Amino acid sequence: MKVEIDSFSGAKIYPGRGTLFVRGDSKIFRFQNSKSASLFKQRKNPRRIAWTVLFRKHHKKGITEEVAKKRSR
Amino acid sequence: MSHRKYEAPRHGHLGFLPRKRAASIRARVKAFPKDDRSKPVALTSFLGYKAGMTTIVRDLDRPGSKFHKREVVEAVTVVDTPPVVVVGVVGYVETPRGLRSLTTVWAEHLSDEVKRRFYKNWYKSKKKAFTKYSAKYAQDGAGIERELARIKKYASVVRVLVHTQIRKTPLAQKKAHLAEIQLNGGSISEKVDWAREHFEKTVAVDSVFEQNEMIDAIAVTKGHGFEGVTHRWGTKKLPRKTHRGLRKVACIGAWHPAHVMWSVARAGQRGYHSRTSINHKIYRVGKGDDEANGATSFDRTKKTITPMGGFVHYGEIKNDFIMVKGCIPGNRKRIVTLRKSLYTNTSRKALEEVSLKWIDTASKFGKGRFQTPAEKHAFMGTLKKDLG
Amino acid sequence: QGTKFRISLGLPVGAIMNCADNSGARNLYIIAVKGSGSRLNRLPAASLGDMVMATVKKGKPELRKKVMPAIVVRQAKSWRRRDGVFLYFEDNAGVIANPKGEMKGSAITGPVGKECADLWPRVASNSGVVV
RNA sequence: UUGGCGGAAAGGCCUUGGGUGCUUUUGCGUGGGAAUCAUUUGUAUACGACUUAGA
RNA sequence: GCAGUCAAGCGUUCAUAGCGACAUUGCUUUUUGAUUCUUCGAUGUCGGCUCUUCCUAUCAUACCGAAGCAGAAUUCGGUAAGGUUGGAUUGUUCACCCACUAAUAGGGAACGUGAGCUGGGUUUAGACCGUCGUGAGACAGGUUAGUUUUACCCUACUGAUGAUGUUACCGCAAUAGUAAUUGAACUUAGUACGAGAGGAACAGUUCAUUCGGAUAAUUGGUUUUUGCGGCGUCUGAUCAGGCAUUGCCGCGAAGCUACCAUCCGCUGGAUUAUGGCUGAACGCCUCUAAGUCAGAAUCCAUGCUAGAACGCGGUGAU
RNA sequence: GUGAACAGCCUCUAGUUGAUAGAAUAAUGUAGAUAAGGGAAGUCGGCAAAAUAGAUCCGUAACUUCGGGAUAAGGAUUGGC
């Protein structure tokens, strides 16, 4: 099979699809969809909240604060 | 030249005149292929319904390009093509004045189908209680057969009365679309016989067409309604700022001739015209299951034909299907009739077939490709998603 | 030749384009295409791989106010491949050929599409990047 | 009654043998055995049409 | 404007590869004049746009002839009506001029085209300048500004409907219109052909123009279903909304069509010019006279759409 | 009343729902928006429409009757708190 990979959405691009942008600086971009491409022009980062696309990791929240702290012996 | 310097082809063809409503809902093929090969196991045509469109990936061929070799995508129209009842053999004879039918030979079983023959085909939908089909006239196949004996003493190119059994899935409609399909093949006496064997039983798409083979598609276009010159003919709007009439022609004709010719572009009807689009490669014939699907990997992976949610406004396909190359005329949920290519010829064109990598299936558009992503989304939802 | 793929025409006559090489030329204006034919009130348009006649608006002085032909290397408007993928470039650019084939500059700057490269092997020889 | 021929259908007919004889419509009467609409809608469509479902 | 005859002459020599005077006969009606037939109870002007149909005196493509055709660019000519860019200047027609092209032909249809548009010029009323005129005012002198009415009765036709008849479907096919064009490149070949320089054909191959038809996977555009950011003002507040274009503004979908998105387009039979066959009148010769073979993008067929009022049959029938 | 750059929206003033409605929503048309990418090629004419936009800071050419040209030009900045 093929697939391509989205340098924006992070997601795999399904075979027989996507658009390739060739830029002046000669970086090569693969955009899965036109949704993806527009936002890259706009200079919306993908980490920023585009779907939210490229996020979807995990890790996160606290436990435990109380006191961010120092002195108080 | 009095005018124009500066003269261009006339937009819009005179052969696709009149641009008028079709006589019938269903396309009718005027002539068919010739009697070259095997007997009437070979029906000249088959019918179906346009489901939507999908795209497929295939092993190409055209050695001259550098782009030649590997998988390459090609457009497909999917048509659901159920087993069709050849009900009868109609005998049309050639004479001078024209053909007139000698007979129709009936099978024992058309039962709902004759009710559908009564629907528009007679008229009135369960309206007042009947409509009627007369019963097989106390075993008087003899009437039908003596009339069969009459067809063998000459020659239509032997023909068959057919219907599409629409009830299968996508159409809310139950009513059959009756068809005249020509039979072509070998010697005439065996031709009557094979045609005879066929009526006794239903006929599949597997019997008529081989995969990849060149099929002419005839169907009836999408209907706009009543339309102006610009969409119809493809003529321009007149830009200006101001116009008494904006999207206009300048002159219908000239001072002489006094009359608006038919040859000139005019508003009127558009769409719902018969049209024949020629030499379509039949990429796949099959069933959703269990002819097969896809290998796995490889050649390439198993994929049900429908896109998720169904094709818009069609519904879902789950039965016999035929994948045809490119476009096919009509909208969706319309009869398309398939014919073996009339046009001998022969030239180059597709000269080798095209090994099935993919259907599509998608599972895409912000997710996909099927098995794994549906599982992946399901962990994440979960409740509204499927499974629980 | 066959370019062997199909593109939709970016540039009508009178378009402002980058000059892809260092011939001295910074900027072309497209006068004609070598091989288009057209219809009434209606522009000839060029696209990727075409042989064009251009004038260099900014450009050598000798080349300025001169007409010299160029082949369009890059285009902002989409190219559609045999595989099916759509490819685009940031900019519109060409390098200055003769219709004869004779020179004007040593090297290229920025990428060229593989399709342009097949067609004109002498441009391709001076290519940093092929895409 | 028997039947062929034509022409495919119809028709239209035309032949070899025996039982009786000759030499276009318009009703008063007798005998014999489905559409279009409403109502939901379209694969439509200006009005109509078509198309479609109905214990 | 174009053609025919004649052929002085020139073309190294050679009338006729090509060019071709004098003279001379024609033809067309599309420039110009001439006229005064038509219209002064009113024919809207030039030009341009766009839509159509045509013509042949053919610019290209097809087939062919000749050459001062080695190839090869070519020149001239026959048959032949099945594409003929986009721009700059100008109101311009015309033309000039630029890059393209296979080549960017010419002519008509009330100088086709104002109950379609345009309104730049001509051609009202104000004004300036040159010139002329005592002046008023005038110029085929120049210049700036300077209006575009009408709700279709009939006809014509796109399309839709639509009874007689025994009924509904399905089909036939009299016929009508009738799509294929063209280029580039590869193989073939650095070959034939040629001193060399250069540089073909044929077919098989791939692709693109240009046209037509169609479609909505692809992917563009749309998106005033709906959901979310953020601006002012308002219901106490947030929260929830309202108004601000017909969507407040910014962000995107299905459907609908296109950014050449995307799919599909010959052979026979008859012929023209001609080149041949058999072949006389005229014992020979002769491609035609009787006969006949080939041979165009031609014709027709093939291919498609429409098609029972050609005054229709089945079938399926109450 | 909030704005004072015009605009818009308001509130206990107060005033009204124009002499036609209903069903749908085709082309044609009239107001109107947005359009790929290209960017005056269109048209007599860039006509319109888009476009620019407030204000602060910095900066500001030829020419000139030194008054002006000038908001030349060009660029930057601005929230919610």
Per-residue three-class SS string for A37-56: HHHHHHCCCCCCCCCCCCCC
Half-sphere exposure of A4 (CA within 13 A, CB side): 22
Joined tokens for residue B261 = 């010719």
Could you give the 3-state DSSP secondary structure of residue C43? coil
In sequence order, what are the residues at sequence separation of 6 or more whose Cβ sits closer than 8 angstroms to the Cβ of residue B279? B214, B216, B341, B343, B349
Q: How far out from the chain centre does Cα B373 lie?
A: 35
State the best of A8, A17, A31, A33 to mutate against chain B, taking most chain B CBs within 10 Å: A17
CB atoms within 10 A of CB B54: 21
Query: Computed over its alpha carbons, how large is the radius of gyration of chain A?
Result: 19
- Collect all residues from C whose CB is shorter than 8 A from any CB in A: 74, 78, 83-91, 110-111, 113, 128-129, 131
**CA–CA distance, C43 with B244 (Å, rounded to integer):** 28
Could you give the 3-state DSSP secondary structure of residue C64? strand
CB atoms within 10 A of CB B302: 16
- Bridge-based pairing state of the strands C86-88 and A19-22: parallel
State the best of A22, A23, A36 to mutate against chain C, taking most chain C CBs within 10 Å: A22
Beta bridge partners of C17: C28
CB B280 within 8 A of CB B217: yes
Could you give the 3-state DSSP secondary structure of residue C114? helix
Q: How far does the CA of residue C97 sit from the closest CA of chain A (Å)?
A: 21
Joined tokens for residue B268 = 């009127």
Q: Which subunits sit against A, judged by 3+ Cβ pairs under 8 A?
A: B, C
Nearest residue to A36 via CA among A57, A52, A55, A50: A50
> What residue type is assigned to position C129 of the chain?
V
Q: How far out from the chain centre does Cα B361 lie?
A: 22
- Bridge-based pairing state of the strands C16-19 and C93-95: parallel
Structure-solving method: cryo-EM
Half-sphere exposure of C30 (CA within 13 A, CB side): 28
- Residue owning tokens 């209907």: B223
Could you give the 3-state DSSP secondary structure of residue A13? strand
Q: Angle at Cα B36 formed by Cα B30 and Cα B41, nearest 5°?
A: 80
* Binary contact (B67, C4; C-beta < 8 A): yes
Q: How far does the CA of residue A66 sit from the closest CA of chain B (Å)?
A: 32
Q: E strands within chain C?
A: 6-7, 11-12, 16-19, 27-33, 45-46, 51-56, 67-74, 79-80, 86-88, 93-95
Q: Residue C42: which nucleotide is closest by CA–C1'?
A: E86
Q: Which subunits sit against B, judged by 3+ Cβ pairs under 8 A?
A: A, C
> What residue type is assigned to position B263 of the chain?
S
Joined tokens for residue C88 = 């685009």
**CA–CA distance, B310 with B254 (Å, rounded to integer):** 53
Q: What CATH number is given to the structural domain containing C113?
A: 2.40.150.20
Chain A hits for B300, Cβ within 8 Å: 1
Q: Residue B255: which nucleotide is closest by CA–C1'?
A: E112
CB B350 within 8 A of CB B356: no
Could you give the 3-state DSSP secondary structure of residue C60? coil
Nearest residue to B191 via CA among B151, B163, B233, B141: B151
Residue of C nearest to B63 (CA): C4
Could you give the 3-state DSSP secondary structure of residue C19? strand
Chain A hits for B71, Cβ within 8 Å: 2, 15
Crossing angle for the helix pair B188-199 and B141-152, nearest 10 degrees? 150
**CA–CA distance, B213 with B255 (Å, rounded to integer):** 54
- Bridge-based pairing state of the strands B159-164 and B177-182: antiparallel
Instruction: Report CA torsion sign: C14, C18, C20, C21.
Output: positive
Q: For A27-40, give the DSSP string.
A: -EEEESSHHHHHHH
The set of strand E positions with any atom below 7 Å of a protein CB reads: 48-55, 83-87, 94, 98-104, 106-119, 149, 156-161, 168-173, 177-179, 183-186, 204-221, 251-266, 302-308, 310, 312-318
What are the two backbone dihedrals, phi and then psi, of residue B280, each rounded to the nearest 5 degrees? -95, 120
> What residue type is assigned to position B48 of the chain?
G
In sequence order, what are the residues at sequence separation of 6 or more whose Cβ sits closer than 8 angstroms to the Cβ of residue B140? none
Q: Nearest CA to the C1' of E174 belongs to which residue?
A: B97
Half-sphere exposure of A24 (CA within 13 A, CB side): 8
CA distances from C27 to B48, C21, C30, C81, C110 (A): 57, 10, 10, 28, 14
Domain extent at residue C51? 10-131
**CA–CA distance, A66 with A69 (Å, rounded to integer):** 8
CA distances from C7 to B74, B142, B246, C86, C111 (A): 17, 66, 32, 9, 17
Domain membership of residue C81 (yes or no) is yes
- Collect all residues from C whose CB is shorter than 8 A from any CB in B: 2, 4-5, 39-40, 81-84, 118
Domain membership of residue C5 (yes or no) is no
Joined tokens for residue C32 = 């004609």
Chain B residues 171-230 with Cβ under 7 Å of strand E are: 177-180, 216, 218, 221-222, 224, 226
Identity of the residue in C87, C90, C91 whose CB atom sits nearest the CB atom of A20: C87
The set of strand D positions with any atom below 7 Å of a protein CB reads: 7-9, 34-38, 43-46, 50-55
**CA–CA distance, C111 with C120 (Å, rounded to integer):** 15
What are the two backbone dihedrals, phi and then psi, of residue C34, each rounded to the nearest 5 degrees? -80, 80
**CA–CA distance, B309 with B319 (Å, rounded to integer):** 17
Could you give the 3-state DSSP secondary structure of residue A23? coil
CB B171 within 8 A of CB B319: no
Residue A17's Cβ-count burial label (10 Å; 0-12, 13-18, 19+) is buried
Residue C36's Cβ-count burial label (10 Å; 0-12, 13-18, 19+) is middle
Domain membership of residue C2 (yes or no) is no
Half-sphere exposure of A18 (CA within 13 A, CB side): 23
The full 3-state SS of chain B, as one line of letters, equals: CCCCCCCCCCCCCCCCCCCCCCCCCCCCCCCCCCCCCCCCCCECEEEEEEEEEEEEEEECCCCCCCCCCCEEEEEEEEEECCCEEEEEEEEEECCCCCCEEEEEEECCCCCCHHHHHCCCCCCCCCCCCCCCCCCCCCCCHHHHHHHHHHHHCCCCCCEEEEEECHHHCCCCCCCCEEEEEEECCCCHHHHHHHHHHHHCCEECHHHHCCCCCEEEEEEECCEEEEECHHHHCCCCCCCCCCCCCCCCCCCCCCCCCCCCCCCCCCCEEEECCEEEEEEEECCEEEECCCCCCCCCCCCCCCCCCCCCCCECCCECCCCEEEEEECCCCCCCCCEEEEEECCCCCCCCCCCCCCCEEECCCCCCCCCCCCCHHHHHHHHHCCCCCCCC
Chain C hits for A21, Cβ within 8 Å: 88-90
> What residue type is assigned to position B7 of the chain?
E
Nearest residue to A33 via CA among A56, A55, A12, A52: A12
Q: Residue B124: which nucleotide is closest by CA–C1'?
A: D35
Domain membership of residue C4 (yes or no) is no
**CA–CA distance, C84 with C98 (Å, rounded to integer):** 33
Is strand E within 7 Å of residue B142 (CB)?
Answer: no
**CA–CA distance, B100 with B94 (Å, rounded to integer):** 8
CB atoms within 10 A of CB B145: 13
Joined tokens for residue B352 = 């080798």
Note the helical H segments in chain C: 114-119, 121-124
Polymer length of chain C: 131
Q: Specify the resolution in Å.
A: 8.8
The DSSP code for C35 is S
Domain membership of residue C1 (yes or no) is no
Is strand F within 7 Å of residue C13 (CB)?
Answer: yes
Nearest residue to B189 via CA among B160, B142, B154: B154
**CA–CA distance, A40 with A38 (Å, rounded to integer):** 5
Half-sphere exposure of B310 (CA within 13 A, CB side): 11
Number of domains comprising chain C:
1
